[PDB]
Amino acid sequence: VLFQGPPTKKVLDENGQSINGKSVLPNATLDYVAKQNFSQYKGIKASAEAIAKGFAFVDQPNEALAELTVKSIKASNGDDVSSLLEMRHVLSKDTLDQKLQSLIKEAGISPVGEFYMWTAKDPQAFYKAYVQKGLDITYNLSFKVKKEFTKGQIKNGVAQIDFGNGYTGNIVVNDLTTPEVHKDVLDKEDGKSINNDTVKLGDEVTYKLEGWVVPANRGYDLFEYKFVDHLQHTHDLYLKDKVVAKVAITLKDGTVIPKGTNLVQYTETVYNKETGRYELAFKADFLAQVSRSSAFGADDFIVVKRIKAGDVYNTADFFVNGNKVKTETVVTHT
């Protein structure tokens, strides 16, 4: 063939836009669209011996990816061709039978690790119905990320073997960003840490919850950004909070919210004085307006008054798009 048709793969967000090279979160589903190209063979008169080598499609994820869901495998004519393909899932090429190891090896395809492969069950019928007609096959594939993969690049590649000839496609890539948050206890906002120190009965102290900075160049929009702090309300009387932008935030219309801006208008605070449960949550309609090309984050300052003697602990949980993480535990003594 004069003009070859190597396979391709894309990674798409929920709107169908490519998010190649962008970051995602631990709870992300990677939604890939892979193409096995046959349009180059339209009208070919392949030998019976060539056709007999069949048609294989390989997807090779890196170590980051966990369970695969095959959403669909469709020819460009709209046919569901999933029943015509044998699905194999191997931890190494060494577990394939010798026939298929020889096929991939002589095709020049040498997958490094664990991969998935789909082969035509009846190469002659598949050739007649799809390859010879030039009908490309689209694999809609979705993966979760392994819980143990907490940073680095997620990668997924494809290859195809047509009549025993191998073609390798592109490798899509996404960085996995695990959120992280911190807690400190201060004499006041912009003051000094007093963690592990003595606090005089009746003094105010301020908890600082350092939110995670959602990075620019992410492949998703924000819908949840919130802190839940369980105050030791037997000892700490909640007085008030303060939430501020920790980075300069650009919205989708181009508006800039400077670092240090008070963000209260975009949040809701609720405090249960019976339980000690404080929550500060960003509103979803606001979060929706942050540009994907903008970082975003906030710090929250909770001021309380010490109204009982003893050891007083604080910890907070942080949620971003359903991903929960915890701060340190801090303590003061009175």
Write the secondary structure of the chain as one string of H (helix), E (strand) and C (coil).
CCCCCCCEEEEECCCCCECCCCEECCCCEEEEEEEECCHHHCCCCCCHHHHHCCEEEEEEECCCEEEEEEEEEEECCCCECHHHEEEEEECCHHHCCHHHHHHHHHCCCCCCCCEEEEEECCHHHHHHHHHCCCCCEEEEEEEEECCCCCEEEEEEEEEEEECCEEEEEEEEEEEEECCCCEEEEECCCCCCECCCCECCCCCEEEEEEECCCECCCECCCCCCEEEEEECCCCCEEEEEEEEEECCCEEECCCCEECCCCECHHHEEEEEECCCCEEEEEECHHHHCCECCCCCECEEEEEEEEECCCCEEEEEEEEEECCEEEECCCEEEEC
Token code pair at residue 26: 């631990």
CB 172 within 8 A of CB 163: no
Q: Is residue 61 within 8 Å of residue 142, measured between CB atoms? A: no
Contact residues for 224 (Cβ-Cβ < 8 A; gap 6+): 281, 282, 284, 287, 319, 320, 321, 322
**What's the first-to-final CA gap in the chain, in angstroms?**
82
Asked if 238 and 300 count as a contact pair (C-beta separation under 8 A), the reply is no
Contact 163, 51 (CB under 8 A): yes
Domain extent listing, the chain: 1-179, 180-334
The β-bridge partners of 177 are 151
Cα dihedral 229, 233, 236, 240 sign: positive
Report d(CA 210, CA 227) in Å as an integer. Answer: 10
Same fold, 1-179 and 180-334: yes
Buried b / exposed e over 239-249, threshold 16 CB at 10 Å, is eebbbbbbbeb
CATH of 180-334, one of 2.130.10.10, 3.40.50.720, 2.60.40.740, 3.90.420.10: 2.60.40.740
Rounded to an integer, what distance in angstroms lies between the CA atom of residue 108 and that of residue 87?
A: 21
Q: What is the dihedral of CA 210, 184, 208, 309, to 10 degrees?
A: 150
Contact 250, 256 (CB under 8 A): yes
Which of the following CATH numbers is that of domain 1-179: 2.60.40.740, 3.50.50.60, 3.40.710.10, 3.40.50.1580?
2.60.40.740
Name the experiment that determined this structure: X-ray
Q: Are 102 and 160 in contact (CB under 8 A)?
A: no
Structural resolution in Å? 1.9
Tokens standing for residue 127: 């050739």
Per the CB < 8 A criterion, the answer to whether 40 and 4 are in contact is yes
Token pair listed for 316: 């907070």
